């Protein structure tokens, strides 16, 4: 009985840990995805500036 219980508990812990591990790093994934556009505009700043430095 102890073996059956431990096997089932470890099996459940497998996917619960998988889902958690996705959960923490979804934040970083979306943060980088947004930083793409953030830096795009932060660098378009001086593009616009140098356009009229002409």
């Amino acid at each position: 009985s102890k073996r059956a219980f431990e096997l089932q508990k470890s099996a459940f812990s497998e996917e619960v840990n998988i889902k958690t591990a996705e959960a923490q790093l979804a934040y970083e994934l979306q943060g980088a995805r947004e930083q793409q556009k953030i830096r795009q505009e932060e660098i378009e700043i001086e593009v616009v500036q140098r356009k009229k430095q002409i």
Binding site: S1, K2, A4, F5, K9
Partner: protein, 52 residues
């Protein structure tokens, strides 16, 4: 009265012969208690893990 311990051993023989019965009864009782105590322990643990 015997000061040579002649009759004390003759008395002690039957005391041993009854003490063997005294021990056999205790052995019966202990085995009979332990068998079903362990079995009931087994069922309760099995059900507890089933609930877990």
């Amino acid at each position: 009265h015997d000061d040579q311990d002649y009759l004390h051993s003759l008395g002690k023989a039957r005391t041993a012969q009854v003490q063997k019965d005294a021990r056999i009864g205790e052995a019966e009782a202990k085995r009979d208690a332990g068998i079903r105590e362990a079995k009931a322990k087994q069922e309760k643990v099995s059900a507890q893990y089933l609930s877990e």
